[PDB]
Amino acid sequence: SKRKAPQETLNGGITDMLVELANFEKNVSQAIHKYNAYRKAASVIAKYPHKIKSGAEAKKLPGVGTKIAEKIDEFLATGKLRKLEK
């Protein structure tokens, strides 16, 4: 019904990483399956009316599966890592 929310900084940083790599999927030859992966997760997280704090909050979204949702958990968890811990 014509919503158009206001500009705000909620989850516009994640979609920037899903929309960027998303181009790397279609721009590549055999990468159309992972293409829709970030294409949908980038649209739902970029136009979501709320925020998330766990990979599960990204899986409940319509369009995100377990692969893309798994990357979301790494975002809310820490952000980057070189080696593992024990």
Residue 65 is classified by DSSP as -
Binding residue positions for K(+): 59, 61, 64
CA 58 to CA 72: how far, in whole Å?
A: 7
Q: Structural domain of residue 70, as residue ranges?
A: 1-86
The number of folded domains in the chain is: 1
Return the SS3 of 26.
helix
CA 3 to CA 41: how far, in whole Å?
A: 20
Spatial contact of 15 and 42, defined as CB atoms under 8 Å apart? yes
Query: What amino acid positions are annotated as catalytic residues?
Result: 71
The CATH number of residue 4's host domain is 1.10.150.110
By the 10 Å C-beta count (0-12 exposed, 13-18 middle, 19+ buried), 52 is classed as buried
Tokens encoding 19:
């929309």
Angle in degrees, 0-180, between the axes of helices 14-27 and 33-46, rounded to the nearest 10: 160
Binding residue positions for Na(+): 59, 61, 64
Site of tokens 């920037």: 16
Tokens encoding 31:
């990468």
